[PDB]
Amino acid sequence: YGFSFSVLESQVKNGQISIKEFVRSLGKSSVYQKQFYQPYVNSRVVELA
Amino acid sequence: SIVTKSIVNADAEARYLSPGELDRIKSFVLSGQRRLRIAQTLTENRERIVKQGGQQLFQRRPDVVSPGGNAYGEEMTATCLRDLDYYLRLVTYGIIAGDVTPIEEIGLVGVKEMYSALGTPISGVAEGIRCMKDVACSLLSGEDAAEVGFYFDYTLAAMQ
Amino acid sequence: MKSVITTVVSAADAAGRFPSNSDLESIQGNIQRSAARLEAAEKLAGNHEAVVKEAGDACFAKYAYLKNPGEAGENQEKINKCYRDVDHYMRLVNYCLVVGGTGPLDEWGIAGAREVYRTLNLPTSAYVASIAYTRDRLCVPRDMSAQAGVEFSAYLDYLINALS
Amino acid sequence: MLDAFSRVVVNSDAKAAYVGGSDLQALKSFIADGNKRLDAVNSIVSNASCMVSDAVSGMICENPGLISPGGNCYTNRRMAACLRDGEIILRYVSYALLAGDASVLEDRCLNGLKETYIALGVPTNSSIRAVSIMKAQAVAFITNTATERKMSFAAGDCTSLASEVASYFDRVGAAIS
Amino acid sequence: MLDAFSRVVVNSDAKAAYVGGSDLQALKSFIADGNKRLDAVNSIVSNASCMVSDAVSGMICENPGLISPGGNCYTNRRMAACLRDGEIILRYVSYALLAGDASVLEDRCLNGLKETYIALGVPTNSSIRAVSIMKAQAVAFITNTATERKMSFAAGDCTSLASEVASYFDRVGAAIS
Amino acid sequence: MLDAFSRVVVNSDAKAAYVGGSDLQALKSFIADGNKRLDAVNSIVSNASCMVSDAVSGMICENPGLISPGGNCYTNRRMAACLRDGEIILRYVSYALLAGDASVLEDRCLNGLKETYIALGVPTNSSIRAVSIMKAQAVAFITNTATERKMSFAAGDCTSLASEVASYFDRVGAAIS
Amino acid sequence: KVVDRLDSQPSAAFEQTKQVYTFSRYILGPHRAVVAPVAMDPSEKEVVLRAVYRQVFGNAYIMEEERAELRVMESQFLLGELSVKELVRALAKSSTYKVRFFEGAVQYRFIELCFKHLLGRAPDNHEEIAVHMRKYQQEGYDAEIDSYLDAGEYDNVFGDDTVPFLRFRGVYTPCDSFNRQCALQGGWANSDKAMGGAALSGYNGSDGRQMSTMIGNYISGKPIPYEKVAADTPLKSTAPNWYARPNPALAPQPAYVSAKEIAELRSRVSKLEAAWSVAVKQSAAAKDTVETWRAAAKEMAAMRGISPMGEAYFGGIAQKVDNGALAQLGNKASSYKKYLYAIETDEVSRLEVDLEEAKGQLRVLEAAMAKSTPMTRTAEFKTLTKNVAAVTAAEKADPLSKRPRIS
Amino acid sequence: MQDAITSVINAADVQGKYLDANSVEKLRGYFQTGELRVRAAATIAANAATIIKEAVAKSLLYSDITRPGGNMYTTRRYAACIRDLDYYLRYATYGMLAGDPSILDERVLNGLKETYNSLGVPIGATIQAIQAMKEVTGSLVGSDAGKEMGLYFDYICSGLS
Amino acid sequence: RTAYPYTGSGYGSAGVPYGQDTYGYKATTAKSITETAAQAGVFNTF
């Protein structure tokens, strides 16, 4: 879909933050919660996490 | 190259290289004599491969060179052929590396951001590389033209 | 920097006096006149790349012989330097409107220009064809205000009077 | 020498820029209180003959070894020079308050004053106190809080010119330290 | 200068009002005679501009070979450096008089001064004359027995501060001998 | 300053000798090609106003930051100043070729150019690039291998004076580095 | 011929200022001519009198209370029967010029003061002084100044109309004549009572010796060191206030210089100097990747030129033309402005900025190591393991003395 | 991360006092320019790609950082630039709306000059790109709005220096 | 070969590791304010 996290690919490719930081920021992103948080239940969100 | 990413593949998997990986590093280095001959043909044919490359490019895309086109005038047309000299050079790297890894991280990664940010029609530069491919494969036999053309069309694929 | 301050603190410093009422009165003129001459410093800054483009080709439309080989504008690099120099003279006029006097022109562009244009064989009449085209392209209430066109032109033909 | 108009010119020459819309709001605000600056220079130069005797004699009652024999305010020719450089410094600070930039302070007054005062044998720490009483007076005159002469003014805030003239005396007091 | 007596810290967020773990007992005990010491350093540094010029010209007029050409104080850079170094030495005794001990003086001012003055050809026999004038000058000022200048102190005694500061000046004077 | 005849006179006056026939074989050979030295130094002086603009602007095309604002060859004062010392150096080298002795170069042109160019902020590596372009031109005009101008000359060899004018240009390179 | 004639020849007929004084540092600061008008207001007579007292006394405090022998020599000038040359001769014959710069001065300090006061320049060579030494000792001081201002120097470069000034004359006949100039006329602050040290040797600032520095530079050929010609300096007073990217003004000398800071800085300025000499051979041809196709891309692009405005219609749309000199080559506003941004973006200029920036940091750090024995050090760096040894036992460099006791 | 209102509230709160006449005096000054900042941030959002295309072509397009060996040669390296210049034009837009440059050093300036030295990115060419980008931004938003947007560009250039 | 080389690996690299020492985000080595001054040996009263 041509999505882009240029800031996060910045701060991970330089090593400014870990992959774990890049993964956590991806989880709190809004393109995530629009994908795997909004259409589901808090019950189903826990398993998909 | 095939040597460096066959390593980093088996590197990530916490293992050594299989026979499938080591019978191809073996098969690639015996192929190395034939690769340098192929790259040696394109090395001192850049005068014709580029100039005839931009030959068909303007006949097929007169908009880019017409007044208003991105490569208009004596100035931009020189740079119009400069990029073709770049991409013709990277294909010589890919032939000797046995992979588009040199072409990948040079001239392909984020190429649409550059040409979109330069105002250049990215489809137009793709047409230029295709015109160079017919000139390049016309300089080699059938066994070689399946390789030298093979790296151009990968560059065509990633450039659109 | 020949300005309205640096004549009243250069003549008082050579005299050895405090800034008296004759010198505070001169900078009261730097409040009334500078409402207009900064407007011509702002319109020239926001439209500089189109002014030099409209002016620098009048150097070559009038004198078409410069693109001949052996002459001054013979190749690509020497044409770009010829458009660079009219951008310089349009930049110091923007510096002179914001200083208040002819300070950045008499020190940075004018002084020594008759020794470099004779040594490098540049025709200095080709420079004033570009500046006097800019003076006559000036519509007075369209480009800027009525007073800001006075201030912008009076540094322009001062620069013409320097080069000729 | 420069002023507050041509300091942002040679700053804009450092980036090869035109003086566009970003920098002219720094200068149109500078001529917005241009009537305030001339009301601040006029408080300095109207008491400038009295401030220099107020400040040199304040240095004497603190460090009285200058007028002691062998000192540096003992000889009467040597006293009359110390009243002169109290007011040449006040002449060049008042040009720096007028121009709005301390270039004429740092190219004409302080241009070699440090090796002057070494080679004349002038005590440098007393030259700080000759300067800094004029700092504490000019910030009292510009804020109009001088405790024995109030000047008439249209009322309003003036504390930026007070810290501006305190910034010009600290460039004098650091360059001769 | 300001380490020579200890301050108490009374406010919070300090980590010395609470987790100080000490009070400085060696310098709480020196405000038990602190006003008498602070008048003594004020007796020196209000005359320190005049004590250095009198003492350096004292050894000039007793040994006149220094201002002869070929001597070590004829040129202007050397004459300015000789007036600077007596001023620095008089400051560092006035640290050691203020702090009540000579431990500031021996490492910041005297450690490596005898090797310096033989590396520059400075006459060591004449420089000890220059501090013995300042030894004799400082005991006149602290005991208020100066001939041309008195100061209005309180009613009391200041011997054993005058002999304290006279014990620092030969401690200078043997560290360069 | 000296010339090629008076260089061997002060060489012979150091031992108080007469100028005998064993010494004079160089000087009788010096006037034997004295036609060639005037024929050499005419070719530099007839092209000297284009030799400087070939060289100072040839420094520009190698280091194009000098014409950017900040670089030391930017303002029309600075370009007219850099062209001015382009032809001061070319004047004194052509003086030194004419006299045949490097004394007039080293006491009048180069004595203190290094400390001058430090004080003005002139970059000292770029001035070698201005000199070495004038080094390659003066050996081209003398040997008549200039690729866009040939001058009329009598037939014969000339490379001794091409070597002598080459050694007068590396004295300029060694003086200011 | 960039400069047609020097300042020592007079200005011929057709200029108001001489050709060397146009593009020198004459025009920037206050070292100009303030030539007297024909008839003038007594305020304008005070202007030309105040510049004479600044020039020929050299910022000395003339103590306007007395002006004892001055007001006869003033009143000869205020009438008009004394020239400005004849005023500046008569001031140099008085007692208040003698008790400042002659009664305590060496004959090197006196000759170098008359070159700054009466003329503009410094003394150039050695035998230029040795004329004026032998002219004083056989004819006296009153016949010295009369034989000093009436040569061919003063009557051309100032005439009998203008006051003297510091002659920033552009062409300097030794190169050290600019160096001793700026070392004598020491900035806008320093006077010659200060510079010769006449106050500090003075008995209460009176009747002291006017001793001199720079006597070693007039005997031997030796330049002035650069700190006296860049710090306490008239070039700071007639400063252009540019953006000079190598800044010529020297930094103040730091306390606590370390040898560890210098020994990597000298290796850094050898690193850039060896890398500059490599990169300058590859300049302007092989660094331009678009240069190789300029012979073909401006003959490929010479097809179907359009003479009026309007064509390249391209199937029936507008798509017009610009037809100027610039855009017929396809260039833009970002194509001539690319020369102004050539300090970061260049490569050869990126070395030469940091070469002269770090050599200028070297020349004040190395010159701050003139202080050795009692100097308190510090360790601002984190005391790393990098350390050069003290191996200085035997000969390592040994400059070639082939005549060791040749006799 | 404070705007002009957050900074005014913080200083008035940090002394425990209410919002007196001086604190509200600056707040009224910020609300007066509230109309100017949105239109400034409006056009900058529209011409984001056009402004960055104008700056690089005007400052560092043809310099030898663009050529081989220069700091911007490969297409990944060139593409990182316009990605990198987008943040400067974007975060400067945030400072122009918030009226306080706290967001810049919070999210841009810290570890920035220490990062370019690691990669070997030329700080000299970077500032001139931002200076040229500041020059075109004054073209769009006008003079005073350019003065506002320009006031945060050189803040980046100052700290990045 | 250009002097201002760069960092990184793979193709398009100048032979210098990332960050000049293979560290992208370098841990600092400085101390705080008051004991950077304590090590200097000159800010003792401060």
Ligand SMILES: C=CC1=C(C)[C@@H](Cc2[nH]c(/C=C3N=C(/C=C4\NC(=O)[C@H](C)[C@H]4CC)C(C)=C\3CCC(=O)O)c(CCC(=O)O)c2C)NC1=O
């Ligand atoms: C800061 C200084 C500054 C100026 C002086 C003007 C100068 C100027 N005017 C025009 C452009 C124009 N200028 C005019 C105005 C006139 N034409 C005439 O012949 C009359 C004398 C006059 C009527 C008042 C018109 C009508 C145009 C558009 C058509 C044309 O180019 O003539 C152009 C070409 C670019 C453009 O289209 O705007 C330029 C540089 N603009 C500036 O930014």
Ligand SMILES: C=CC1=C(C)[C@@H](Cc2[nH]c(/C=C3N=C(/C=C4\NC(=O)[C@H](C)[C@H]4CC)C(C)=C\3CCC(=O)O)c(CCC(=O)O)c2C)NC1=O
């Ligand atoms: C401070 C203000 C300032 C200026 C005014 C200019 C002045 C100036 N122009 C040129 C240099 C030049 N100037 C021109 C200009 C022209 N020749 C032509 O074909 C036309 C007649 C005319 C433009 C319309 C050319 C072609 C050169 C290059 C000369 C050469 O390479 O021989 C140079 C020499 C260095 C260089 O730039 O290459 C200088 C100092 N530069 C400045 O920095």
Ligand SMILES: C=CC1=C(C)[C@@H](Cc2[nH]c(/C=C3N=C(/C=C4\NC(=O)[C@H](C)[C@H]4CC)C(C)=C\3CCC(=O)O)c(CCC(=O)O)c2C)NC1=O
């Ligand atoms: C343009 C810059 C400029 C200045 C800043 C002043 C300052 C100044 N003062 C003096 C000269 C002097 N200056 C002082 C001054 C002082 N000694 C003290 O103890 C006090 C601290 C201080 C007075 C406040 C004295 C005492 C002399 C006299 C020295 C002498 O006559 O020998 C001199 C040397 C002049 C000369 O004697 O020939 C200068 C340059 N004058 C200038 O032209």
Ligand SMILES: C=CC1=C(C)[C@@H](Cc2[nH]c(/C=C3N=C(/C=C4\NC(=O)[C@H](C)[C@H]4CC)C(C)=C\3CCC(=O)O)c(CCC(=O)O)c2C)NC1=O
């Ligand atoms: C031992 C001797 C001795 C003195 C003579 C005074 C001198 C003196 N006055 C002021 C402080 C000042 N001095 C003046 C000067 C003057 N007031 C005027 O109205 C006139 C213009 C001018 C006297 C002719 C002014 C205006 C102030 C500021 C406060 C005020 O008086 O209103 C200061 C600085 C503040 C301070 O350190 O206390 C000093 C040292 N104080 C001393 O300790």
Ligand SMILES: C=CC1=C(C)[C@@H](Cc2[nH]c(/C=C3N=C(/C=C4\NC(=O)[C@H](C)[C@H]4CC)C(C)=C\3CCC(=O)O)c(CCC(=O)O)c2C)NC1=O
């Ligand atoms: C030629 C000589 C010359 C001057 C002397 C000044 C004179 C001057 N001062 C102000 C005007 C003013 N001056 C002040 C300044 C002050 N008020 C204070 O309470 C502080 C004590 C002091 C600050 C330093 C203020 C606050 C105003 C009104 C606001 C303003 O006009 O800027 C004004 C504008 C109002 C009026 O018409 O009077 C003028 C003309 N301008 C000149 O052209």
Ligand SMILES: C=CC1=C(C)[C@@H](Cc2[nH]c(/C=C3N=C(/C=C4\NC(=O)[C@H](C)[C@H]4CC)C(C)=C\3CCC(=O)O)c(CCC(=O)O)c2C)NC1=O
């Ligand atoms: C913190 C403690 C401290 C000091 C005590 C001084 C000590 C000191 N003095 C000098 C340096 C000097 N000190 C003198 C002083 C004198 N020579 C004489 O003949 C007189 C007897 C005597 C004056 C009273 C002179 C003349 C020089 C300069 C030597 C020279 O230039 O030849 C130097 C060399 C560096 C310099 O020039 O300053 C040092 C470290 N400096 C310090 O930092």
Ligand SMILES: C=CC1=C(C)[C@@H](Cc2[nH]c(/C=C3N=C(/C=C4\NC(=O)[C@H](C)[C@H]4CC)C(C)=C\3CCC(=O)O)c(CCC(=O)O)c2C)NC1=O
């Ligand atoms: C040959 C030349 C020559 C001199 C220049 C003077 C210098 C001088 N003064 C004193 C001695 C002294 N010097 C001072 C100093 C001062 N007194 C004051 O009131 C002033 C504030 C300050 C000088 C500025 C004091 C206080 C004494 C002690 C004697 C006394 O009570 O006055 C001594 C030491 C005498 C001793 O040790 O017994 C010398 C050498 N004497 C000379 O023989």
Ligand SMILES: C=CC1=C(C)[C@@H](Cc2[nH]c(/C=C3N=C(/C=C4\NC(=O)[C@H](C)[C@H]4CC)C(C)=C\3CCC(=O)O)c(CCC(=O)O)c2C)NC1=O
């Ligand atoms: C008698 C012997 C003699 C010389 C050898 C020359 C050399 C020389 N040049 C300058 C002065 C200068 N010289 C340069 C020169 C250059 N800047 C560059 O980047 C280039 C590398 C170089 C030219 C090729 C510049 C730019 C100035 C002017 C600096 C300024 O005005 O501040 C000066 C100071 C004079 C003045 O500015 O008034 C001198 C002495 N002139 C002489 O009189």
Ligand SMILES: C=CC1=C(C)[C@@H](Cc2[nH]c(/C=C3N=C(/C=C4\NC(=O)[C@H](C)[C@H]4CC)C(C)=C\3CCC(=O)O)c(CCC(=O)O)c2C)NC1=O
């Ligand atoms: C960046 C721009 C640029 C230049 C300006 C030139 C500058 C230049 N010229 C020469 C080399 C030369 N330069 C000249 C100079 C001239 N020829 C003449 O006939 C005139 C008298 C004078 C021009 C007015 C001469 C005579 C030579 C020797 C070879 C020759 O041209 O015949 C050299 C050394 C060898 C070389 O690289 O070619 C350089 C750098 N080259 C450049 O790359």
Ligand SMILES: C=CC1=C(C)[C@@H](Cc2[nH]c(/C=C3N=C(/C=C4\NC(=O)[C@H](C)[C@H]4CC)C(C)=C\3CCC(=O)O)c(CCC(=O)O)c2C)NC1=O
């Ligand atoms: C008043 C001005 C004045 C001059 C210009 C010269 C003119 C001159 N040149 C030569 C003569 C000559 N000049 C040269 C020199 C050269 N030939 C070459 O092939 C080289 C290119 C170049 C060396 C740099 C040679 C080789 C001769 C012939 C041998 C000789 O006579 O020295 C001669 C002697 C033969 C003749 O009469 O023509 C004269 C008078 N002499 C003068 O008095």
Ligand SMILES: CCC1=C(C)/C(=C/C2=NC(=C\c3[nH]c(/C=C4\NC(=O)[C@H](C)[C@H]4CC)c(C)c3CCC(=O)O)/C(CCC(=O)O)=C2C)NC1=O
């Ligand atoms: C939001 C604040 C912020 C900034 C500014 C930032 C910058 C940043 N710039 C980077 C690289 C880069 N930056 C540039 C930039 C330039 N080259 C030039 O010549 C010019 C001077 C300049 C463009 C103006 C280049 C070429 C790289 C790639 C370096 C490499 O591959 O080695 C990288 C490495 C990782 C990556 O790009 O994915 C980071 C993290 N990160 C941040 O979080």
Ligand SMILES: CCC1=C(C)/C(=C/C2=NC(=C\c3[nH]c(/C=C4\NC(=O)[C@H](C)[C@H]4CC)c(C)c3CCC(=O)O)/C(CCC(=O)O)=C2C)NC1=O
């Ligand atoms: C090795 C991989 C690689 C590539 C490909 C590359 C491209 C590249 N192309 C450029 C310009 C350009 N490229 C073109 C290209 C074209 N015009 C047309 O009509 C055609 C469709 C097309 C060519 C076939 C033009 C006209 C410019 C100049 C644009 C301008 O001046 O605004 C520039 C800016 C100038 C320069 O530094 O050369 C770069 C960096 N860089 C790289 O490192």
